[PDB]
Design a binder for this molecule. Sequence first.
Ligand SMILES: C=CC1=C(C)[C@@H](Cc2[nH]c(/C=C3N=C(/C=C4\NC(=O)[C@H](C)[C@H]4CC)C(C)=C\3CCC(=O)O)c(CCC(=O)O)c2C)NC1=O
Ligand SMILES: C=CC1=C(C)[C@@H](Cc2[nH]c(/C=C3N=C(/C=C4\NC(=O)[C@H](C)[C@H]4CC)C(C)=C\3CCC(=O)O)c(CCC(=O)O)c2C)NC1=O
Ligand SMILES: C=CC1=C(C)[C@@H](Cc2[nH]c(/C=C3N=C(/C=C4\NC(=O)[C@H](C)[C@H]4CC)C(C)=C\3CCC(=O)O)c(CCC(=O)O)c2C)NC1=O
Ligand SMILES: C=CC1=C(C)[C@@H](Cc2[nH]c(/C=C3N=C(/C=C4\NC(=O)[C@H](C)[C@H]4CC)C(C)=C\3CCC(=O)O)c(CCC(=O)O)c2C)NC1=O
Ligand SMILES: C=CC1=C(C)[C@@H](Cc2[nH]c(/C=C3N=C(/C=C4\NC(=O)[C@H](C)[C@H]4CC)C(C)=C\3CCC(=O)O)c(CCC(=O)O)c2C)NC1=O
Ligand SMILES: C=CC1=C(C)[C@@H](Cc2[nH]c(/C=C3N=C(/C=C4\NC(=O)[C@H](C)[C@H]4CC)C(C)=C\3CCC(=O)O)c(CCC(=O)O)c2C)NC1=O
Ligand SMILES: C=CC1=C(C)[C@@H](Cc2[nH]c(/C=C3N=C(/C=C4\NC(=O)[C@H](C)[C@H]4CC)C(C)=C\3CCC(=O)O)c(CCC(=O)O)c2C)NC1=O
Ligand SMILES: C=CC1=C(C)[C@@H](Cc2[nH]c(/C=C3N=C(/C=C4\NC(=O)[C@H](C)[C@H]4CC)C(C)=C\3CCC(=O)O)c(CCC(=O)O)c2C)NC1=O
Ligand SMILES: C=CC1=C(C)[C@@H](Cc2[nH]c(/C=C3N=C(/C=C4\NC(=O)[C@H](C)[C@H]4CC)C(C)=C\3CCC(=O)O)c(CCC(=O)O)c2C)NC1=O
Ligand SMILES: C=CC1=C(C)[C@@H](Cc2[nH]c(/C=C3N=C(/C=C4\NC(=O)[C@H](C)[C@H]4CC)C(C)=C\3CCC(=O)O)c(CCC(=O)O)c2C)NC1=O
Ligand SMILES: C=CC1=C(C)[C@@H](Cc2[nH]c(/C=C3N=C(/C=C4\NC(=O)[C@H](C)[C@H]4CC)C(C)=C\3CCC(=O)O)c(CCC(=O)O)c2C)NC1=O
Ligand SMILES: C=CC1=C(C)[C@@H](Cc2[nH]c(/C=C3N=C(/C=C4\NC(=O)[C@H](C)[C@H]4CC)C(C)=C\3CCC(=O)O)c(CCC(=O)O)c2C)NC1=O
Ligand SMILES: C=CC1=C(C)[C@@H](Cc2[nH]c(/C=C3N=C(/C=C4\NC(=O)[C@H](C)[C@H]4CC)C(C)=C\3CCC(=O)O)c(CCC(=O)O)c2C)NC1=O
Ligand SMILES: CCC1=C(C)/C(=C/C2=NC(=C\c3[nH]c(/C=C4\NC(=O)[C@H](C)[C@H]4CC)c(C)c3CCC(=O)O)/C(CCC(=O)O)=C2C)NC1=O
Lengths: 164, 164, 172, 134, 177, 177, 177, 162
Amino acid sequence: MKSVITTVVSAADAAGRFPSNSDLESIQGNIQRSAARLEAAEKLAGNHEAVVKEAGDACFAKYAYLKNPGEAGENQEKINKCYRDVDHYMRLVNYCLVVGGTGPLDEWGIAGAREVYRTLNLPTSAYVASIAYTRDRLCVPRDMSAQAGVEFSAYLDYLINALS
Amino acid sequence: MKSVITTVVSAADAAGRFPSNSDLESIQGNIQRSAARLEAAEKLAGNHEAVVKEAGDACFAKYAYLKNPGEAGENQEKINKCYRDVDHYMRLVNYCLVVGGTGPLDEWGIAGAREVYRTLNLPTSAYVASIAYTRDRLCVPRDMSAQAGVEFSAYLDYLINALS
Amino acid sequence: MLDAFAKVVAQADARGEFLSNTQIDALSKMVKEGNQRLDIVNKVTSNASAIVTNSARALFAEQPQLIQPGGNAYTSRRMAACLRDMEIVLRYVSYAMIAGDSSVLDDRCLNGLRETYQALGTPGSSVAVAIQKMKDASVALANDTTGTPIGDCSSLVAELAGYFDRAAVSVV
Amino acid sequence: TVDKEAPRPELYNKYFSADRLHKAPEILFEYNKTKYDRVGVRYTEVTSKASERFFPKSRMNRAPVIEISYREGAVSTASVSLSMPEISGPPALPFPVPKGDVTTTMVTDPTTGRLKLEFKVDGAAVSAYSDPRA
Amino acid sequence: MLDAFSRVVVNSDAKAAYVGGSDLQALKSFIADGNKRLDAVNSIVSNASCMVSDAVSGMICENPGLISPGGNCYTNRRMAACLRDGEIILRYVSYALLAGDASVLEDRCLNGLKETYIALGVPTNSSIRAVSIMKAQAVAFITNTATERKMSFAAGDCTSLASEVASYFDRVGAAIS
Amino acid sequence: MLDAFSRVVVNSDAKAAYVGGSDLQALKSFIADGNKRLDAVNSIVSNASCMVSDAVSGMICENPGLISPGGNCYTNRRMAACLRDGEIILRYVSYALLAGDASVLEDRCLNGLKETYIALGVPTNSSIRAVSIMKAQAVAFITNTATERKMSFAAGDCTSLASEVASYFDRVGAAIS
Amino acid sequence: MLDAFSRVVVNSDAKAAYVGGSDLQALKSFIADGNKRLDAVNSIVSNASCMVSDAVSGMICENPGLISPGGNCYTNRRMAACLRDGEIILRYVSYALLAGDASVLEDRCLNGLKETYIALGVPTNSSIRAVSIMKAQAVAFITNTATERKMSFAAGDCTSLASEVASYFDRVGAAIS
Amino acid sequence: MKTPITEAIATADNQGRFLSNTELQAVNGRYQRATASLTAAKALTGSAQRLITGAAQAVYNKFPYTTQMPGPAYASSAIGKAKCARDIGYYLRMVTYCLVVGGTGPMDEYLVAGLEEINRSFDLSPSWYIEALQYIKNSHGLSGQVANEANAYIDYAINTLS
Ligand SMILES: C=CC1=C(C)[C@@H](Cc2[nH]c(/C=C3N=C(/C=C4\NC(=O)[C@H](C)[C@H]4CC)C(C)=C\3CCC(=O)O)c(CCC(=O)O)c2C)NC1=O
Ligand SMILES: C=CC1=C(C)[C@@H](Cc2[nH]c(/C=C3N=C(/C=C4\NC(=O)[C@H](C)[C@H]4CC)C(C)=C\3CCC(=O)O)c(CCC(=O)O)c2C)NC1=O
Ligand SMILES: C=CC1=C(C)[C@@H](Cc2[nH]c(/C=C3N=C(/C=C4\NC(=O)[C@H](C)[C@H]4CC)C(C)=C\3CCC(=O)O)c(CCC(=O)O)c2C)NC1=O
Ligand SMILES: C=CC1=C(C)[C@@H](Cc2[nH]c(/C=C3N=C(/C=C4\NC(=O)[C@H](C)[C@H]4CC)C(C)=C\3CCC(=O)O)c(CCC(=O)O)c2C)NC1=O
Ligand SMILES: C=CC1=C(C)[C@@H](Cc2[nH]c(/C=C3N=C(/C=C4\NC(=O)[C@H](C)[C@H]4CC)C(C)=C\3CCC(=O)O)c(CCC(=O)O)c2C)NC1=O
Ligand SMILES: C=CC1=C(C)[C@@H](Cc2[nH]c(/C=C3N=C(/C=C4\NC(=O)[C@H](C)[C@H]4CC)C(C)=C\3CCC(=O)O)c(CCC(=O)O)c2C)NC1=O
Ligand SMILES: C=CC1=C(C)[C@@H](Cc2[nH]c(/C=C3N=C(/C=C4\NC(=O)[C@H](C)[C@H]4CC)C(C)=C\3CCC(=O)O)c(CCC(=O)O)c2C)NC1=O
Ligand SMILES: C=CC1=C(C)[C@@H](Cc2[nH]c(/C=C3N=C(/C=C4\NC(=O)[C@H](C)[C@H]4CC)C(C)=C\3CCC(=O)O)c(CCC(=O)O)c2C)NC1=O
Ligand SMILES: C=CC1=C(C)[C@@H](Cc2[nH]c(/C=C3N=C(/C=C4\NC(=O)[C@H](C)[C@H]4CC)C(C)=C\3CCC(=O)O)c(CCC(=O)O)c2C)NC1=O
Ligand SMILES: C=CC1=C(C)[C@@H](Cc2[nH]c(/C=C3N=C(/C=C4\NC(=O)[C@H](C)[C@H]4CC)C(C)=C\3CCC(=O)O)c(CCC(=O)O)c2C)NC1=O
Ligand SMILES: C=CC1=C(C)[C@@H](Cc2[nH]c(/C=C3N=C(/C=C4\NC(=O)[C@H](C)[C@H]4CC)C(C)=C\3CCC(=O)O)c(CCC(=O)O)c2C)NC1=O
Ligand SMILES: C=CC1=C(C)[C@@H](Cc2[nH]c(/C=C3N=C(/C=C4\NC(=O)[C@H](C)[C@H]4CC)C(C)=C\3CCC(=O)O)c(CCC(=O)O)c2C)NC1=O
Ligand SMILES: C=CC1=C(C)[C@@H](Cc2[nH]c(/C=C3N=C(/C=C4\NC(=O)[C@H](C)[C@H]4CC)C(C)=C\3CCC(=O)O)c(CCC(=O)O)c2C)NC1=O
Ligand SMILES: CCC1=C(C)/C(=C/C2=NC(=C\c3[nH]c(/C=C4\NC(=O)[C@H](C)[C@H]4CC)c(C)c3CCC(=O)O)/C(CCC(=O)O)=C2C)NC1=O
């Protein structure tokens, strides 16, 4: 992981420094955001039954080739276990939205994914359109507010720009 | 130089990563800090020609033995070195108030300091006997603002832990 | 050398195509300001020895360690070569004022200027503070309302600052 | 460029001179609510064309263009814009041209490009005459 | 500089000249309601091309024998001359709005205007009909009461300068009466 | 916020304007089938430059007398003026598609164009042939039934908007007949 | 590495002064415009996979002699490296704009990449055609005038900021030159 | 590439001089032939499509052998004509580029520099090439001083091959 609170005390530990004023300054800007940042995850949790009911099958709605004989989304032990794995990705950003950092993505999911999914007979392009439909569905005042939505978008695209 | 910006990108160069969403609320931590920070810096420049005297005579109001023969403050061209050397310490304070870190202190004034004070027979605690008089002289709404006095006194805590 | 008209020639010669019509009405905006370019270069080079010697004099006042013996600009050989380079930047900035781009200033004068100074040992932070005197002595010279009629030339004085700060960040 | 057609018998010269003919003060305005707002007048020759009963010189060739940015399912960043500039047409029609004669063209945004056409096929410097003699 | 406004005109020569920002307030203190009056010209000259086209076509579509073969708005050199003729009387009434008097409009435009039109055969009953549409436009643009284009202005009344231009258009119609 | 659109088209000058995300929802709600209509104007103006280049060259391909010496597609300024007359009507019919009416089409573009063309020597039946290709080219782009190009769209029909431009292109051909 | 806040300190150091109110006036206006720059660089790094897509697949269609057998991007390691060599140099200018100073770009990469590249054999004119293809790719994103993806910002004018990332990328290309 | 601005600069630099009132007047005349040269190369792109192969047919109807000769260096078959929508379009491109800068800049280094080596060792004799743009100089559709400024750099390109 790396949040804002550990990344100052890790470079203070590699030189053995005391917590300086710049270390005292780096914590303050989380408080200006986490009034609006910690209330985006609670809308993300109560709607979590219906967003992957909308976007998790949208990448099956663009792709009927995922259900062929010898595929990943073909039958009920692997269709419903697709919804096993995709609601972890809703859960992973719910753990990134509360820490203020990019921590639990590459703690748990982003870490070495190109040698996971090059074995499992999985394209990475199926993983694209599930969150690519999720991100452009954001209109501003209903799921978000103005200053809340400036960084929930930044957690939508951070997994997009990592694995691709 | 140690600042509030040098921790952000030298970690991100060691991470091999972009500036994420995590890296920029030290910069929101910067601008909430930097409004009432720099009011302390220009207020020091409107007084400092007396302040390095009025804290500078206090170490001669504490340790009168320096004016003896054979000592460091024995004559007038050596006493104006002692006001040269104390103005250059308080010239690095307002540099340290601009950058928001401690880097100008820890390269030009602290790094290599205590190896030359021994060899030139200068007392390592008469300097911190002087800027201790800089620390109690604050009455916080009058000289500073109500929050800016603590963020100025926190750099007086750094340099008396550098010589002691 | 290249001026602003020579930009979009070479910005379309490797592209291959002809000059498109949506670019050149911005370039025929530039000839409306062609008469407010040539007064302004005439404002700089008429006072071209009063911006140099008034800012070298205010450089050695604040920094007495350059004219002290053993300093960099001590002798009469190295004083004349300090006033030489203070006027050289005043030429190549005003060359970039009349042309419309930076690309004669940072190709004939700033391409290795700080690495000239690291080899010779001159303080490269201190040539920037002489240039920023000459920035303030010329931007405030090119806002007089004598000699020209009045009117808003606020767009063209930011270009004169923008090459004076380009020599302020070239030499450090 | 000399359409002497005003029949024009010389019976207008005692009331309107030749130098002071079809010349009127045109007033200019740099009115942008700014400190450099100038008013000016200038006194030039007045010309007109016969088309301007219905298409005057301010409304001459000004048609409302539409630019639409739209990715698929991206209505939160999709936008419409509207302007009417002095709109010029596309580049000109070519020669009649015979059994082909490498039909020309031009396309794209940055620059005009332009290729070479052999009626559909676009040869354009591949050097088909490649015959060394060993 | 009101004389140097006139010295664009009276030396019969094509130049360009302006008035700067410090030179504006000398004219604005001198000319009463100059913030209204510079708005009054700028309401006209921003639509000076459209003012002549509704004026000449309302003269055409009410008097349809003018575009006949034999009519005086045939033979497209003669049509373009009539569109030029409505422009010069629009700029001279706009400069009369700026200068505040019609005394530069009377000698430069209206003097000799009467018998120079029967010199060429202009139907002057159509010409009084042509300038009356421009009288209806200029009271719509200055009062911001045009039926299709409203413009942004400072809030207030402009009924004196509406009547002054409508006085100044009547000197054009009485010159060809 | 169509008043904000109509004030762009009434000011008779060059002025850029654009719509943010809130007012686009006011655009999509005020105009019916706005998900369909804004697709239909985008399918034309993405390929509007090839539509004017094909159709008047198809007018050359059926009427070859226009590029004769003495024809009206000779003297390449006049050839480009036919291309300039090609591009204005496509921007005007797309705004007539977008507003849902032809009331902006009649006054700004179709008023007096027949009298303009017979005074300029323009062969108006040749332009009827050029604009009938435009009625076929706009329908094949709205229905996405073009032979050489196929753009991605949402599923469904657009035959109301495919028939609406045939109402709009016949208004141009009735205006110049 | 230099900061712009550090830039006024060494300005005030060989001068041996304190910090006055005079040079302080640049930096206090830099604070309130800090959020506008903070609204810029988040969209530079989040569309970076597209900017390294069009870095190398765009430069190879305008010189395809490197995918030829014998070229300098022929094998699938040099195909892999050219995808990798461009995604570090826009990572460095994302660091460089937050400090504001180009010296962090100079000491880390722009001191000596030119001397490697003629011993690594790659051509520099191919590189600056691939440098400048990210230049206009960058300046669309800061202004929100990009075509296929339009992102969330506020409303204003960052053309002082949009020249600054164009003030970096020419010196990216001039370093290889 | 020698812009008339850039030799006011380069003949103020080899003497080591500030930009005096001598070279300030030469860039004023570049601002005086600005508008009368910028309508030329704008509208020459507006009528460019006729001028490429309408000038090519003014060579084959002058020279019938160029379609009839057996050789690689002619427009006889269908591959030589595709070079002939390219190799005389370069002459039409740089005459637009000279009217941007107001001087004879881009064709002095891109076109004319080292040209007899290209001509003699391909046998591409310029008796076609002079008549390739001789159709352009009289059928451009331009009048006034816009004609004479557009015809100013055409016959500089004539005399460099003649
Ligand atoms: C956790 C984050 C989160 C979101 C982003 C939304 C996404 C979302 N929107 C809707 C459902 C809806 N969403 C919108 C609003 C919008 N739809 C769009 O396509 C526009 C871009 C946007 C603003 C105009 C509307 C109008 C509906 C009802 C009609 C519909 O189904 O689209 C639904 C179905 C259930 C519901 O009503 O909530 C979902 C999951 N909901 C969430 O829980
Ligand atoms: C860049 C930042 C910077 C500094 C922090 C100072 C630090 C400093 N002080 C002194 C040097 C000195 N400093 C003192 C100062 C003191 N002795 C006393 O009796 C008091 C305790 C105290 C003053 C209150 C004296 C007396 C000398 C002279 C040493 C000598 O006589 O040999 C020197 C040696 C060179 C010299 O003599 O000037 C240096 C480097 N100078 C700098 O340039
Ligand atoms: C830049 C920072 C800065 C400061 C820290 C003070 C430091 C300082 N104090 C005084 C002068 C004074 N300063 C104080 C202030 C105080 N005395 C106390 O006992 C309290 C601790 C404190 C707040 C009540 C008082 C009461 C005087 C008058 C004389 C004295 O007692 O020193 C003076 C002389 C000129 C003046 O009055 O301004 C200076 C420079 N001033 C500054 O400009
Ligand atoms: C050979 C040398 C040479 C020059 C330097 C220029 C000088 C010059 N400037 C102006 C004319 C002018 N010049 C200015 C310029 C300025 N006003 C300011 O407040 C700024 C300080 C300054 C810009 C640097 C303005 C505002 C005008 C009047 C507006 C206008 O040009 O239309 C005129 C009158 C003709 C005209 O209006 O264009 C001339 C000859 N021309 C030359 O031939
Ligand atoms: C100094 C001020 C000044 C003017 C006011 C006009 C006045 C004016 N108008 C025309 C000339 C003309 N004026 C008109 C105008 C009209 N005829 C009509 O039927 C309509 C009523 C009306 C237009 C709406 C026409 C049609 C001609 C040309 C007549 C012809 O050439 O046969 C001439 C030509 C004779 C000559 O050139 O000497 C002059 C001086 N021109 C000026 O220089
Ligand atoms: C706002 C309203 C508006 C329009 C509808 C267009 C229409 C338009 N076209 C031309 C002008 C022209 N229009 C054409 C067009 C054509 N001739 C043909 O033989 C083809 C059939 C057709 C092209 C396909 C030509 C050739 C000219 C040139 C005549 C000239 O330049 O004098 C003119 C100028 C006529 C004049 O000066 O009076 C106008 C107003 N432009 C506008 O501003
Ligand atoms: C076919 C027959 C035919 C007509 C009967 C006239 C139509 C016409 N329009 C106006 C009247 C007007 N005409 C305009 C002019 C314009 N309005 C704008 O929004 C544009 C900016 C500008 C060019 C169109 C204005 C501002 C008025 C006054 C407002 C009004 O009453 O309509 C008048 C004078 C008022 C009156 O009715 O007495 C007439 C007669 N034009 C014709 O062609
Ligand atoms: C440089 C060019 C230049 C101009 C174009 C004018 C423009 C102008 N007019 C007014 C100000 C005004 N303008 C008008 C005019 C009008 N209001 C109406 O309701 C009518 C539509 C219209 C009549 C024509 C009025 C009534 C005022 C307020 C009174 C006044 O200041 O004159 C103001 C001051 C506005 C303010 O700050 O509140 C300005 C800048 N002045 C200039 O210096
Ligand atoms: C901001 C700009 C903007 C646009 C460009 C449109 C674009 C647009 N149209 C539709 C949605 C649609 N779009 C079309 C249109 C078409 N389908 C076809 O097969 C025809 C080729 C074409 C007509 C020309 C239809 C028929 C629908 C579904 C019904 C509807 O929503 O109107 C959708 C939603 C797609 C979905 O449900 O996933 C979008 C984004 N709307 C906008 O807000
Ligand atoms: C030499 C003589 C010559 C012609 C007679 C015409 C040939 C021509 N093409 C189209 C018809 C068309 N032309 C286009 C235009 C285009 N298609 C695209 O994919 C591009 C985007 C764009 C420029 C090429 C379209 C979309 C159609 C309708 C679909 C089709 O028939 O192709 C039509 C109208 C349909 C009809 O009534 O037949 C005609 C007459 N072009 C010529 O050159
Ligand atoms: C040679 C083969 C070839 C390609 C590989 C593509 C690639 C490509 N894209 C652009 C041009 C561009 N490319 C982008 C990049 C993107 N747009 C977005 O919004 C996405 C988030 C992002 C990833 C795709 C942008 C923003 C522009 C500028 C155009 C614009 O959108 O305004 C350019 C022009 C830049 C230049 O050369 O100067 C090229 C060559 N086009 C081609 O002709
Ligand atoms: C600061 C950023 C930064 C870099 C750029 C690289 C610098 C760099 N690039 C390459 C190496 C390379 N870089 C490229 C890329 C390119 N060559 C071209 O012809 C194109 C112009 C361009 C793509 C846009 C290629 C093709 C190689 C060759 C790999 C090889 O030789 O095996 C190597 C050799 C790697 C090795 O030997 O292991 C190094 C050190 N490192 C860094 O830290
Ligand atoms: C948590 C992550 C995080 C961010 C994403 C930024 C978010 C951010 N952006 C702006 C605010 C802004 N950002 C822009 C920038 C732009 N507008 C444009 O028209 C251009 C497209 C673009 C770049 C030129 C402008 C013009 C403002 C308003 C001015 C301002 O108050 O800063 C503001 C200040 C006002 C507000 O509270 O909204 C903030 C906090 N800061 C953060 O802490
Ligand atoms: C073509 C344009 C051009 C540039 C860009 C240039 C840079 C340049 N500056 C030089 C020297 C110098 N430059 C300086 C100037 C300074 N040092 C300081 O400490 C001051 C801060 C500053 C003066 C204000 C000095 C003192 C020398 C050394 C002269 C010598 O050693 O002889 C030298 C060594 C040769 C010499 O002039 O003696 C070069 C090449 N020379 C050029 O001809």
